[PDB]
Structure 1
Amino acid sequence: MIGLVGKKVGMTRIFTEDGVSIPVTVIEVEANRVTQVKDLANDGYRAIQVTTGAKKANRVTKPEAGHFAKAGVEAGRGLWEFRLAEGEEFTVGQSISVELFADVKKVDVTGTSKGKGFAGTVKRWNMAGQMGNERVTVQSLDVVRVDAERNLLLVKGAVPGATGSDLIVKPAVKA
């Protein structure tokens, strides 16, 4: 349906009642507010633009400030797009919480791999080329716990990238 954008902070382990250790990743998911709505009539397809975080007004470029003021929302750190599933349509300025993933139990995480120096053929394939600064998508991941008041989301296993990176969580298409 629609995915949110969060920030990686760290990763640790979680202990269950039965006494089982499961790796988890600390992801802070700020409430993403819709800024622009693209429709078939005008834009040619259905989509919603989501912004997260905040930036100092000094560094915000005037075109970006005007675009944000058009939607009447605070300027964030970036913009992301998600393709709708022909479901309910949102409105500009509609804040989106993390409750959507509270009843899915299956999500996919997309991130950016950490940069690395040139790697040999054996290191990469076991062809030389640039390592890092590339996409990484991991699917079939189940959310462990969801905290609405804390905006903290936990997923089994590790996630791509290092601390401070920006990741995207989407509903698990595979089923």
Structure 2
Amino acid sequence: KSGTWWDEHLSEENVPFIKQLVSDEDKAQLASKLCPLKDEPWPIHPWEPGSFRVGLIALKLGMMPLWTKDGQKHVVTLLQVQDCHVLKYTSKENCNGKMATLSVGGKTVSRFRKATSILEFYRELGLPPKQTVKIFNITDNAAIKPGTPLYAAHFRPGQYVDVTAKTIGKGFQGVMKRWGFKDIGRVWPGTKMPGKMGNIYRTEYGLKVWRINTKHNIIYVNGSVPGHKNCLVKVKDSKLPAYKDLGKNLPFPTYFPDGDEEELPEDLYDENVCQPGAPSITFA
């Protein structure tokens, strides 16, 4: 009748043992999904105009200055992909939408703080539970087998991405900070008044990928993204019309490092990015 938590009744001897046991299985569960292309992968189709591939969940590490060969400075946000896997596939008919949906999971989290139903879902999939789960609308040719790991090299330098996350929560704020403000007998619905500010989902559209770090799975994206550092963000191909149909040269349906290709360099750069070890630039 009373409440309980995982180690409430464990002894001093069994708390370290159980902590190890559940940590070793997680490491072995993530290492068993590192070769998706030899585990009966789903059909890999070529990219076609009008295709929509999946995105990924990344953690916001922070911001860094970046310089271009034209001598301009650019501030970028480092987005690191941590334990990102495909979790579920839904076809067009069952999804109640025009496009099929691919569910993707983010950072690995403790199994001791998750609902039983969620714990049962991950048990079947064979993956540690995730912190955030997002839905991406895909075409039928972009379907990826649930359990496939997603990496930062899924995006390439020169590409644009929309980034969605919850904004920094400012709590109950006044009109001046919330709205920047210092007679029909009623207030209209939607009137700007004091209330809870921030802590809502926002999207930053058309942020170019300056650089990719394959070793640490970090995406260097232009400008800033909503939310605090170490928050989980949803990264997706830019929906802006100018950036339509530029996925012809991007990994489709996704990037499989297991696949037969020359291993990518530690860092992938955009043509205009000044690399750290390059000579000092001159404008002549």
* Same fold (TM > 0.5): yes
Would you say 1:109 and 2:163 are equivalent positions? yes
Q: Which protein, 1 or 2, shows the higher relative CO under an 8 Å CA cutoff with sep ≥ 6?
A: 1
Q: Structure 1 pair 123/76, CA: closer, same or farther in 2 (3 Å)?
A: closer
Instruction: Tell me what 1:6 maps to.
Output: 58
TM-aligned CA distance change 1:41 to 1:115, over 3 Å: closer
1:16–1:79 Cα change, 3 Å = same
Please provide the CA RMSD for this pair.
2.0
- Aligned residues of 1:104 and 1:171 also touching (Cα < 8 A): no
Do the aligned partners of residues 60 and 17 (structure 1) sit closer, same or farther apart at CA in structure 2, a change above 3 Å counting?
Answer: same
- The Cα of 1:39 is off from its aligned counterpart by 1.8
Q: Would you say the 8 A contact 2:167–2:202 is kept in 1?
A: yes
1:36/1:71 contact within 8 Å kept: no
- 1:18 Cα deviation after fit: 4.6
Q: Alignment partner of 2:233: what SS?
A: strand
Alignment of 1:80-119 (within 5 A): 80-102=134-156, 105-119=159-173
Of residues 213, 217, 224 in structure 2, which corresponds to 1:151? 217
Answering whether residue 126 of structure 2 is matched by residue 60 of structure 1, we say no
Whose Rg is larger? 2
Q: Give 2:177's aligned residue.
A: 123
Question: Letter of the aligned partner of 2:77 in structure 1?
Answer: T
Q: Which amino acid aligns with 1:90?
A: I
Higher helix share: 2
Distance change (3 Å), C-alpha of 1:122 and 1:108: same
Question: Which residue, 232, 236, 242 being the options, matches 1:170?
Answer: 236
Alpha-carbon displacement from aligned partner over 1:66-119 (angstroms, at most 9, x marks no partner):
111212222222321111034332112122222231166111111111111333
Normalised by the length of structure 2, the TM-score is: 0.56
Identical positions, percent: 27
**Do structure 1's residue 37 and structure 2's residue 103 form an aligned pair?**
no
Give the counterpart of 1:16 among 68, 78, 83.
68
Determine if contact 1:37/1:47 at 8 Å carries over to the other structure.
Answer: yes
Alignment-derived partner of residue 142 in structure 1: 208
1:115 is paired with a residue of what secondary structure? coil
1:145 CA displacement: 0.3
Q: Deviations over 1:24-71 (max 9, x none)?
A: 112111252112111235444521111122122322333222111212
TM-score (norm 1): 0.88
**CA distance in structure 2 between the aligned counterparts of 1:156 and 1:87, rounded to whole angstroms:** 29
Say which is worse superposed, 61-70 or 152-161, in terms of deviation.
61-70
Give the structure with the higher percent strand. 1
1:160 aligns with 2:226: yes
- Can you give the 5+ residue segments of structure 1 that lack an aligned partner in the other structure? none
Q: Secondary structure at the match of 1:96?
A: coil
Using the TM superposition, name which of 72-81 and 40-49 deviates more: 40-49
